[PDB]
Design a binder for this molecule. Structure first.
Ligand code: SF4
Ligand code: SF4
Ligand code: SF4
Ligand code: SF4
Ligand code: SF4
Ligand code: SF4
Ligand code: FES
Ligand SMILES: [Ca+2]
Lengths: 145, 576, 905, 145
């Protein structure tokens, strides 16, 4: 998970970084400057994680590419309402125990933390109204509320 | 807590009263989606329970329904007493605005129940139909013979082992039945109809001919001493068909019961199926269904009133305008088949506002014309007042609902007492009469109901909600067509719903509505499958036809003809 | 074990997983990657439930029910909101890439993915991006490939590779481009590839033969029947539409063939739809072929049979017990002949004597999977009894199962079991004239002539028990391999000895019986399996009769001047010249058959008999199990002039017309009662299925689903008046929807599996007592004979070793799954799959003849010179020549025969 | 005067053609099973390119109640009820309408819907990846990760 400037005083231990909503991992930290957009960084991360899926189990194999496509839409400014909620549901349902191995929880940890902290960039990605239906001529659509 | 939730109704005071009277081990409470406390009674305590419910401080005064059920193939009977067959009794307390269903479990080798006719006289025909279609005997019944099928019929067609589809046609059986019709009058025994004193040498026995039906008349001169209406000439096997069609593909059959009603007959069936599916329809669906039901109520009332005026000797353009609007909305005039599980088949067409506005702006002058032609006509008034009049006691004991019940002064309309389809969001009055329900009061009440239905249509036009015409439920059948044609999971849902059928989880649902001629109810038993395990249709015209001998006893044949015209009934509703 | 599902207490098996325990209890959990026969892998992530630590726990945790043991005191929830949301999400993720294909997909209405989409309540697409696509492969004539519809549930590869041991299907690629198919285009080589169309939960692998004449599952008229294409007797559900046999589905039988058929049974039904089948009785007068109706056919046939001095009947192992018995009653017991040759009859009654008098238990097909060592003697099981070969592969994997059970690994955790038991397997020793398809898992394969195979069996029996006869002349290396086999067989708790009649050798069956008796004398739990040739070979052997050579002798000598041939072409069991001459000598030949055969040219009368789709009857298994098959459709429903009656009905009415001059179209139960009264060894066939008066709470059993369509239109082009529903007086099934097919109905015969919410072959879960177990009220079929109290004696007729003699060529039989069986090789889709006619030779013999691979050689057998191209066979032995049995012109009676004048054409 | 009928009117049943001129029906048999009367009978056939079409298509109009459940059930909008009601006949056998009596030369009430533009299954003029919202097929031997 991404951590902020306030977490920089944490000792590099398993328990302290775990208590802050992240994990110590390899203890090889990566610093992100203000010139880096979080949506592009998380799009790059999820592109790696989705193409490094082993293809065995459904949530990683088929929901990491969905997060990749949502992040590409948000990076191009073509986001639509419900995208952030879809990302959060993907983060919740790819957690520990839902997938066969631990690749997908590690994949959704940065997406979780980036939405948690830098949410304004993700909401800045949303610029289009939601649509996945085109009009069929003789059929009046069911206008859901 | 939605309206379709499964409830046992243990907080209903009738359950506590039954527990304090008969003991806690004398009955079994079943949790259902009928909206009604359902209790299983021992057969030996049925008359005691009925008599106790008849004598409560706010008594259960009306036997609404009585029928049977073949429980042999029912696989989901958890919490239910062991039964091969069962008989249910739907009883209504009007002062309490409550109802209770009693169920008697029967083994296959002992299919006899005590007769309920000593407590409620409409149980006569209800028990004759249960004997006819299920073979359940009722001990003590005066004339327990077949009422739907002919008397020379083998088998009980509503049993699960009876083949539903039509058997091979035999010319020889047709000639045999024609021969039986040939000297039916010559070999007429007035013991096979429940009559008595057959030929005093002054009693004449005749046969006669809203549908065509026979009634045998015993006349002393011109006075009616007794009569037995012979029905079942219009029996279509609608309930047995309910077990042979899916929940979706049964809807046209709901149309063809009470064929002057259309969408009015669709409404209780789709409401009960939505109860089984756990569907809460959106508000636009409610207003669309109310608008179509009130248009068809206006059409049926206009036909009934125009037939009554012509029969006495005291009409088409209005019904043509209604049929044109219904044809625009649904594509069909008489049998629209347009309501759906979860909604309606299509959205309202663009231009429906203009047609409804043209209908509503052209109607009140016709309303004044009908009120002048009916309420202010002396020949109609002198022909129709006082002929076949009954009070509140006779309407309660015979299951009379609709205009006759409210003409007796009992303010009982389903749209106000037990609201459905968002009828509580409309402002309309329920016209009631004095204490006497004769022909004139019934026709006057129908005219006032016409005015109130026009008010409801005005409110439907003025604020028609914007929203979906189908519910967002997964069991909405069919799904919206544009998402079906574009999306794969919606295509999958549509594929499975229109072919095998939608899977309703195993439960029982009930819905009664104020139909054009009284109270129409659907009682549906689902066994978890894609078809109905049991489709029971309670129709008002059956009960109203049963009340005829108790109302024209001592009248003339012309009085009987006027009474038959004054009853809003059709024979498909009686026989279904 | 005690589990609590949604607060409700249940008693389950603690050795099961939660998914199979909950499906056995009637609960619904969606699933894709799990199968009852393949074990649990935890791939699709669909079967998630919420597990709690105890009763006073509210948080819980999402677990996979297929990967979770149903241990004592378990607390789970299926109807938890978070679990339901997750399962709907898994269906949504599978739906993101799924093609908009349901109308033009052969799986529609029969698709498990559709069912689990609806069951989770997912009907709203919020995915707006692109779908991945895939190119399709050509998988041969039987299986159609559509990789777009894949959900990557891995069932196909796990079945085809870890269960059926096929090598040419696999998973390729990676993250979300995972591909399931062959490495390149070509025919799938597994003999059990056809089970993919039911294993695959989607429409990727579909029945191409059904796809040619496709119809949906609700439009199908099904019946429970028995596969007619070999002796294994796998239960099938044939389904028809518009008067033609559309599909063969697997009918579950937890005792025989539980989930799987072979490809011959699944795809060799096409002979039923041949347009040259006899549909009416036809009488030959001069050059004229007068079409008759049933009554005047019986009258004319009875007149000619009455005027004749002696009438003989020739049965067939194709025909049911009732048809052969009715022929035996028409002609008398002394004039009835089985239609098989004398050597075939000798081998068949020897195998019958071993099975019902040898004192050794013969196992059902499902029970074969639990044996600890297998010796197959002389039988090409993959080409003659294929489902037994699949069960043998399961028995071989039993060793890894035991090894993983030793480490306390649960038996459903298949990946751990296969990892623990890497390449370890139970011992398998196969013996044939050449290499078999079981050689990949066989510990040892013996390629030798049938005399040497028998001698190896006799030597194994002598090494196990010294009272068995000895074999003289065994080489030291062959002796070392014999001791390897003996140490493996003696060390097994449950040894199984498989042999059969297809080797063409009596001595092979005798050697197998000797090995089984020697193992039984040592206290082992030995079983013996005998593979017969045809669907009712064992029933025809039990009934008995003269050989075909005796019938031909009676025709040639003039003692019999009338012959009634029942369902027999007579060329597979005798030389065509002799058969044709004998039948041309007879002044009355009457052929009762459902296929257009060559002997119908000589036939004076031809009765259009019914095949298994249009008839009822009883067939006897290779294990002695009597099984009833039921008529699928009435042939006269669409063509009103078709007179296609059951063979027993024809022969019973002919006997009635012969005796009393009045026809009697009898009932099936009357014929079965006559069988059990007259033949006491066949008395068990009464209990095979209940009689025609059987009801489920008063109603019959429905042949077609409740949503069967087109009732007032399917015949409307013939006449707009709907015809009478065809009446079934023979069985308890009705030819309509107006019947019972409930999963809880007290019956054993299930025409098709369907339950609400379960439209796929996964609906068989609802019809079983536990998933993958038996049917809830017992599997159908009854064993005719019990195990004898005392065994046979040792067969002392040890043959000499095979000696290659000059000028003569011993014919080594080669059986083909596609081609050897008569009716299935008549099916048109089998011709592409059928091998080309190839005569097999040793390299030494081919070099001696101066013949290379592919050059055509000519040989004369029984005065008939035929020419075939040569394939070089390395594994064959010198002096032997390999011929494909059952093909066109190569009768299966050529096995063990010799060949003369083999020279280059 | 001619009788006016609204566009939704449930009269004579026709089979329509897609805008390219090919017949819309793919012989999916949903209309036949959705018919409560059971008066539709058809058989699936397939062209050389793999396109599904009806071999025959017959409707028993002596039985049909003009309820529109088939048109509602059609996933390709092939079968349509049209504003025409003059279907009287002399012989009841002539009320069985085959495919040559139903297949009109235009799109009917739904002028632009093409089911085959949505289906992933390939026909002539539309290979894999050319349907709506479909990516091109990535070969499994591609160099890209
Ligand atoms: S979570 Fe692990 S097992 Fe599942 S597909 Fe991804 S990498 Fe493979
Ligand atoms: S595999 Fe199933 S869900 Fe997919 S297109 Fe075929 S029927 Fe539809
Ligand atoms: S091809 Fe079928 S069996 Fe194989 S993984 Fe895909 S859906 Fe499963
Ligand atoms: S093994 Fe034999 S009985 Fe079984 S499916 Fe194959 S051919 Fe039929
Ligand atoms: S309109 Fe109704 S009755 Fe007529 S063919 Fe269509 S579904 Fe059948
Ligand atoms: S539902 Fe439509 S596409 Fe399917 S078979 Fe019927 S007319 Fe053809
Ligand atoms: S069925 Fe358990 S994860 Fe697939
Ligand atoms: Ca039969």
């Amino acid at each position: 998970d991404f951590l902020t400037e306030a977490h920089l005083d944490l000792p590099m231990e398993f328990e302290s970084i775990g208590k802050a909503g992240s994990r110590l991992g390899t203890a090889l930290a990566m610093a992100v400057d203000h010139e880096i957009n979080m949506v592009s960084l998380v799009r790059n991360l999820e592109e790696f994680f989705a193409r490094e899926s082993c293809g065995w189990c459904t949530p990683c194999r088929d929901g990491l590419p969905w997060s990749v496509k949502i992040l590409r839409a948000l990076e191009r400014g073509e986001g639509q309402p419900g995208d952030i909620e879809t990302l959060e549901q993907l983060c919740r349902f790819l957690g520990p125990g839902k997938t066969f191995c631990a690749h997908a929880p590690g994949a959704v940890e940065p997406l979780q933390s980036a939405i948690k902290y830098f949410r304004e960039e993700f909401e800045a990605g949303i610029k289009q109204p939601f649509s996945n239906t085109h009009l069929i001529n003789g059929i009046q659509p069911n206008l859901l509320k | 807590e939605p309206a379709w939730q499964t409830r046992d109704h243990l907080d209903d005071p009738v359950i506590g009263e039954l527990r304090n009277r008969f003991g806690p081990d004398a009955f079994t409470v079943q949790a259902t989606r009928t909206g009604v406390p359902v209790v299983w009674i021992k057969r030996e305590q049925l008359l005691e329970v009925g008599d106790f419910l008849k004598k409560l401080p706010k008594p259960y005064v009306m036997l609404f329904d009585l029928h049977g059920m073949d429980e042999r193939l029912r696989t989901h009977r958890e919490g239910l007493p062991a039964a091969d067959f069962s008989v249910f009794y739907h009883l209504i307390s009007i002062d309490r605005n409550r109802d209770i269903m009693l169920k008697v479990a029967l083994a296959e080798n002992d299919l006899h129940v005590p007769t309920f006719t000593k407590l409620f006289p409409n149980a006569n025909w209800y028990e004759r139909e249960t004997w006819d279609l299920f073979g359940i005997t009722f001990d003590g019944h005066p004339n327990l013979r077949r009422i739907m099928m002919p008397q020379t019929w083998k088998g009980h067609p509503l049993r699960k082992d009876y083949p539903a589809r039509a058997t091979e046609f035999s010319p020889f059986e047709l000639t045999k039945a024609k021969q039986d019709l040939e000297m039916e009058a010559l070999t007429f025994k007035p013991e096979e109809w429940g009559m008595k004193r057959g030929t005093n040498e002054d009693f004449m026995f005749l046969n006669l001919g809203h549908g065509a039906f026979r009634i045998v008349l015993q006349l002393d001169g011109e006075e009616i001493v007794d009569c037995v209406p012979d029905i079942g000439y219009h029996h279509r096997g609608a309930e047995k068909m309910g077990e042979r069609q899916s929940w979706h593909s049964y809807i046209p059959y709901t149309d063809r019961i009470e064929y002057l009603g259309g969408c009015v007959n669709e409404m209780p069936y789709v409401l009960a199926v939505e109860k089984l599916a756990g569907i809460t329809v959106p508000d636009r669906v409610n207003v669309i269904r109310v608008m179509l039901s009130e248009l068809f109520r206006i059409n049926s009332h206009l036909l009934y009133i125009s037939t009554f005026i012509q029969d006495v000797g005291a009409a088409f353009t209005d019904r043509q305008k209604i049929y044109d609007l219904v044809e625009a909305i649904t594509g069909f005039r008489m049998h629209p088949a347009w309501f759906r599980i979860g909604g309606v088949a299509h959205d309202l067409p663009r231009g429906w506002d203009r047609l409804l506005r043209e209908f509503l702006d052209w109607m009140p002058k016709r309303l004044a014309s009908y009120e002048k032609a009916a309420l202010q006509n002396t020949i109609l008034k002198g022909r129709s007042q006082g002929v076949a009049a009954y009070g509140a006691k006779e309407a309660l004991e015979w299951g009379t609902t609709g205009a006759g019940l409210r003409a007796t002064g009992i303010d009982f309309d389903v749209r106000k007492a037990r609201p459905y389809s968002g009828y509580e969001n409309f402002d309309f009055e329920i016209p009631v009469g004095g204490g006497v329900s004769d022909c004139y009061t019934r026709v006057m009440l129908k005219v006032e109901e016409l005015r109130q239905s026009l008010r409801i249509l005005e409110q439907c036009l003025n604020n028609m909600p914007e929203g979906p015409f189908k519910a967002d439920h997964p069991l909405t059948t069919p799904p919206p067509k544009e998402r079906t044609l574009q999306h794969i999971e919606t295509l999958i849902t549509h594929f499975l719903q229109v072919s095998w059928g939608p899977v309703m989880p195993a439960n029982e649902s009930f819905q009664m509505i104020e139909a054009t001629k009284g109270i129409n109810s659907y009682y549906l038993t689902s066994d978890g499958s894609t078809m109905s395990y049991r489709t029971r249709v309670r129709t008002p015209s059956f009960a109203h036809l049963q009340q005829i001998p108790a109302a024209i006893r001592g009248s003339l044949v012309s009085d009987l003809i006027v009474y038959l015209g004054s009853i809003d009934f059709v024979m498909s509703d009686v026989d279904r | 074990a005690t589990i609590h599902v949604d607060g409700k207490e249940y008693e389950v098996n603690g050795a099961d997983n939660l998914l199979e325990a909950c499906l056995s209890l009637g609960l619904d959990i969606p699933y894709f990657c799990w199968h009852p026969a393949l074990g649990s892998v935890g791939a699709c992530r669909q079967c998630a439930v919420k597990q709690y630590q105890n009763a006073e726990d509210t948080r819980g945790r999402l677990v996979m029910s297929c990967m979770t043991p149903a241990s004592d005191g378990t607390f789970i929830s299926i109807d938890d909101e978070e679990a339901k949301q997750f399962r709907e999400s898994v269906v949504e993720w599978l739906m993101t890439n799924h093609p908009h294909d349901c109308p033009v997909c052969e799986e529609g209405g029969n698709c498990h993915l559709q069912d689990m989409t609806v069951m989770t309540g997912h009907s709203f697409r919020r995915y707006r991006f692109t779908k991945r696509t895939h190119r399709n492969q050509d998988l041969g004539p039987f299986i159609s490939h559509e990789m777009n519809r894949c959900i990557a549930c891995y069932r196909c590869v796990r079945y085809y590779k870890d269960y059926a041991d096929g090598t040419d299907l696999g998973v390729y690629g990676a993250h979300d481009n995972v591909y399931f198919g062959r490495p390149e285009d070509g025919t799938l080589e597994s003999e059990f590839s056809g089970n993919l169309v039911e294993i695959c939960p989607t429409g990727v692998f579909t029945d191409k033969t059904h796809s040619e004449r496709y119809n949906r599952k609700w439009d199908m008229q099904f019946a429970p029947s028995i596969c007619q294409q070999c002796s294994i007797g796998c239960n099938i559900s044939p389904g028809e539409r518009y008067g033609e046999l559309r599909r063969i589905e697997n009918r579950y039988n937890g005792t025989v063939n539980h989930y799987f058929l072979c490809d011959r049974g699944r795809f060799g039904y096409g002979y039923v739809n041949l347009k040259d089948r006899p549909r009416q009785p036809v009488q030959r007068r001069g050059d004229d072929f007068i079409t008759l109706n049933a009554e005047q056919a019986m009258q004319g046939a009875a007149d000619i049979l009455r005027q004749s001095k002696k009438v003989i009947g020739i049965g067939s192992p194709r025909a049911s017990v009732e048809s052969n018995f009715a022929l035996r009653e028409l002609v008398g017991e002394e004039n009835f002949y089985t239609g098989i040759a004398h050597g075939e009859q000798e081998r068949l009654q020897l195998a019958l004597k071993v099975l019902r008098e040898g004192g050794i238990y013969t196992p059902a097909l499902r029970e074969i999977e639990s044996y600890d060592a297998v010796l197959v003697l002389g039988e090409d099981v993959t080409q003659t009894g294929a489902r037994v070969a699949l069960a043998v592969r399961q028995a071989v994997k039993g060793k890894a199962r035991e090894m993983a059970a030793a480490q306390k690994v649960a038996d459903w955790q298949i990946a751990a079991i296969l990892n623990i038991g890497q390449r370890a397997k139970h011992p398998l020793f196969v013996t044939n004239v050449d290499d078999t398809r079981l050689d990949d898992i066989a510990a040892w394969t013996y390629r030798a002539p049938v005399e040497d195979q028998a001698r190896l069996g006799f030597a194994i029996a002598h090494a196990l028990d010294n009272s068995a006869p000895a074999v003289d002349g065994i080489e030291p290396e062959l002796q070392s391999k014999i001791d390897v086999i003996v140490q493996a067989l003696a060390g097994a708790k449950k040894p199984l000895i498989i042999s059969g009649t297809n080797a063409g050798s009596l001595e092979v069956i005798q050697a197998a019986a000797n090995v089984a008796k020697a193992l039984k004398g040592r206290g082992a739990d030995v079983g013996i399996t005998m593979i017969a040739r045809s669907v009712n070979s064992m029933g025809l052997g039990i009934m008995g009769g003269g050989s075909l050579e005796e019938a031909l002798t009676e025709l040639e000598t003039g003692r019999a001047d009338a012959v009634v041939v029942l369902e027999n072409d007579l060329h597979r069991h005798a030389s065509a010249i002799r058969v044709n001459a004998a039948l041309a000598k007879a002044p009355l030949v009457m052929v009762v058959d459902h296929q257009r055969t060559a002997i119908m040219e000589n036939a004076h009368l031809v009765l259009s008999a019914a095949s298994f789709a249009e008839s009822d009857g009883t067939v006897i298994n290779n294990e002695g199990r009597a099984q009833r098959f039921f008529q699928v459709y009435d042939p006269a429903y669409y063509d009103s002039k078709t007179v296609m009656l059951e063979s027993w009905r024809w022969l019973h009415s002919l006997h009635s017309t012969l005796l009393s001059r009045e026809v009697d179209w009898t009932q099936l139960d009357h014929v079965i009662d006559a069988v059990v009264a007259k033949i006491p060894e066949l008395a068990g066939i009464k209990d095979a299925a209940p009689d025609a008066t059987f009801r489920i709470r008063g109603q019959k059993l429905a042949r077609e689903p409740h949503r069967y369509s087109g009732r007032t239109a399917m015949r409307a082009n013939i006449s707009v008046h709907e015809p009478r529903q065809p009446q079934d007086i023979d069985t308890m099934f009705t030819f309509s929807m107006e019947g019972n097919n409930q999963p809880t109905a007290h019956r054993s015969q299930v025409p098709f599996a369907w339950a609400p919410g379960w439209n796929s072959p996964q609906a068989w879960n609802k019809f079983q007592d536990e998933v993958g177990g038996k049917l809830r009220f017992g599997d159908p079929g009854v064993r005719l004979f019990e195990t004898s109290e005392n065994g046979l004696d040792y067969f002392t007729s040890v043959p000499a070793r095979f000696q290659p003699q000059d000028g003569k060529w011993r014919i080594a039989p080669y059986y083909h799954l596609f081609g050897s069986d008569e009716l299935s090789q008549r099916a048109p889709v089998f011709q592409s799959r059928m091998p080309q006619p190839y005569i097999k030779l040793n390299p030494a013999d081919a070099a001696k003849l101066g013949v290379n691979a592919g050059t055509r050689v000519s040989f004369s057998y029984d005065g008939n010179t035929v020419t075939l191209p040569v394939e070089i066979a390395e594994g064959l032995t010198a002096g032997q020549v390999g011929l494909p049995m059952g093909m066109s012109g190569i009768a299966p009676v050529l096995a063990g025969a010799h060949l003369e004048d083999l020279k280059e054409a | 005067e001619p009788v006016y009928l609204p566009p939704r009117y449930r009269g004579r049943i026709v089979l329509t053609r897609d805008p390219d001129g090919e017949e819309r029906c793919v012989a999916c048999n949903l209309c036949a099973v959705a018919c409560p009367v059971g008066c539709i009978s058809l058989q699936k056939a397939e062209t050389k390119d793999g396109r599904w079409y009806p071999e025959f298509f017959r409707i028993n109009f002596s039985r049909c109640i003009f309820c529109g459940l088939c048109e509602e059930a059609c996933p390709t909008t092939a079968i349509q009820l049209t504003p025409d009601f003059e279907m009287g006949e002399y012989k009841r056998q002539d009320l069985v309408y085959e495919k040559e009596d139903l297949l009109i030369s235009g799109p009917g009430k739904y002028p632009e819907y093409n089911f085959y533009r949505m289906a992933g299954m390939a026909i002539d003029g539309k290979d894999k990846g050319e349907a709506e919202n479909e990516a091109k097929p990535i070969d499994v031997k591609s160099l890209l990760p």
